[PDB]
Amino acid sequence: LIAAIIGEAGKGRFESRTAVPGHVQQGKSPSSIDRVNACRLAIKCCNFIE
Amino acid sequence: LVLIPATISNNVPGTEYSLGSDTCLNSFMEYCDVIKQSAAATNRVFVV
Amino acid sequence: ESSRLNIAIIHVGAPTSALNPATRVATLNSLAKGHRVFAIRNGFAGLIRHGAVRELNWIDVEDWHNTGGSEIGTNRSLPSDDMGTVAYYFQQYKFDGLI
Amino acid sequence: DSIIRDLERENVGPEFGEFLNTLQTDLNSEKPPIEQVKSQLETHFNLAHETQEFSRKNDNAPVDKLLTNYYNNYEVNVLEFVLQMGFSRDLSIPLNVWFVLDMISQLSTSKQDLPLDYYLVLNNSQTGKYSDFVRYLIYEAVGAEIHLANRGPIRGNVGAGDRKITFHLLCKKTARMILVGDDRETDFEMSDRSFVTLLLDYYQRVGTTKKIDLLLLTNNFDTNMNNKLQQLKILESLNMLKSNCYVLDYQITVDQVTANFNSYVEGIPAFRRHEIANFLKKRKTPKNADELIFKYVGRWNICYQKKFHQGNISIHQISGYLD
Amino acid sequence: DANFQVKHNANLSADERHLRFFYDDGVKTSAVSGKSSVIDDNTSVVIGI
């Protein structure tokens, strides 16, 4: 609806388009921040339960 | 007057290769890989 | 030997690329101490419906620091689906800890 | 008794109505009811020559113990969902019936079985009329003195192992009854084609999500519609068979359908894919288009593996799904 | 009674035979009755005169 309202705005001034990355949001490879933290926290999990 | 076909679609007759179709193919291929990988993580299909 | 335990790892929820690297470090940390690492494949539903437990070793962990999604499977199913069955399996595999 | 009038009315010989009088199970006796009725069928109808011949003309195959021999006790007794896709045009109605009971007895040797579901489909007009004869036969065979009906499944115990069975008989009389909400006036035409699509209409509206693990195939009358290969092809498309479903094809006569059939079942994936494609190209007309065969076309990617073959009788099992 | 006991001619795992149920094609089936309803109320009985 937001995209539809933008389109009709300015008596058809600009071309509005929707984009839905969606399930691609998970990514192909984890970032370095993710890799570094996954390691810190996994270590802390094991230290706790064990 | 010379035309060098340039479309991600490859709808122009005269060529079997339009400029930008490999760029496009590769970006969509990278997108589909991530989607299939996600399907592989969960008995699920994706309509792309 | 007396202090060695059976550790369970489960992936509950939608996929993230961070799952395999986290599971890798947790498996190595645990194996280093002599504990046995068991991966509950395909969340609680996998456990309940198929008893989908897989033992992990130093070699199994290979290439996981780079890989996205889940190698064991991730889903939003809950133990609620059948506690009794979850409890039966926890007792069978004698889990002494869970991540 | 009412059946005896129905039979005379359907041009059927009195023999049948006469059998239903001399037909009675001893119950208390060591011999299981299915086996009693079975032996009574052989006597009244003299099915000794024809059975022997059915073996003889099929390279002396054991037409009495087709299942029993091939499979071990576990394998035969694990089968729970069975579809019998008609009656052979090569055997008499009493031999065909007998064989139903005989195949049934074969899967019920054990006392360590989960329930059995057996579906008999009597597709053409030739056999269709004997539904009630078969129903009174299966009723006595199982001994449904547990708790017959105009419609519906016959439930009881069966064989050497008293294995709970539920025998389902799909024919046009039951299909008409259904369509007219059980009205007295069920006298209207119904083509074998219509009948196949209504059987499906029922599977999808009844909800059934159980897989057939033994598929009995033969040469039925009305091959234009009741074509062996075409029935298999359909079941493959609708995802109705178990991933290790057994496909038994029995008969005496060898024709082109049997060649077409065997070349498909035993064909390489490339052969099957073309088999399908060229049929569609050669046989599909804009008038033909709607027929079920044009929709539920088979799947080349289903692999089979030969298990048994004694001249004209064979067992193939689904061995994989390429994807 | 064998009727109330797990059936031996079935593709059953040791845990499936202990749980007395198995998941067939999604459907939770009783490893005894073959029925969808896993719990039979007739199995817990008072034996009297």
What does this structure look like?
The structure is cut from a larger assembly and holds 3 copies of chain A, 1 copy of chain B (48 residues) and 1 copy of chain D (323 residues). Chain A is 50% helix and 0% strand. With 50 residues, chain A is mainly alpha-helical. Chain A has helices spanning 2-8, 32-49. Chain A contains 2 helices and no strands. Chain B has one helix spanning 21-41. Helices cover 43% and strands 18% of the residues of chain D. Chain D is globular. Chain D starts with a helix and ends with a strand. The A-C interface holds A 26-31, 34-35, 37-39, 41-43, 45-47, 49-50 and C 5, 7, 14-18, 20-26, 29-30, 33, 35, 65-69, 96-99. Chain E: Heterododecamer of 4 alpha, 4 beta and 4 gamma chains.
What's the layout of helices and strands?
The structure is cut from a larger assembly and holds three copies of chain A, one copy of chain B (48 residues) and one copy of chain D (323 residues).
Chain A: H1 2-8, H2 32-49
Chain B: H1 21-41
Chain D: H1 2-9, H2 14-22, H3 33-45, H4 48-56, H5 66-70, H6 73-78, E1 81-85, H7 93-106, E2 116-121, H8 125-128, H9 131-142, E3 154-158, E4 163-170, H10 172-179, H11 192-206, E5 212-217, H12 228-237, E6 241-249, H13 256-265, H14 269-283, E7 302-310, E8 313-321
Helix pairs in contact in D: 1-2, 3-7, 3-9
Protein name (chain C): ATP-dependent 6-phosphofructokinase subunit alpha
Binding site for beta-D-fructose 2,6-bisphosphate 1 (chain C): 76
Organism (chain C): Komagataella pastoris (Yeast)
What is this structure, in a nutshell?
This is part of a larger assembly, with 3 copies of chain A, 1 copy of chain B (48 residues) and 1 copy of chain D (323 residues). Chain A is 50% helix and 0% strand.
For the structure shown, list the relevant keywords:
part of a larger assembly, 5 chains, A: 50 residues, mainly alpha, 2 helices, rod-shaped, D: 323 residues, alpha/beta, Rossmann fold, eight-stranded mixed beta sheet, 8 strands, ATP-dependent 6-phosphofructokinase subunit alpha (chain C), PpPFK_gamma (chain D), glycolysis (chain D)
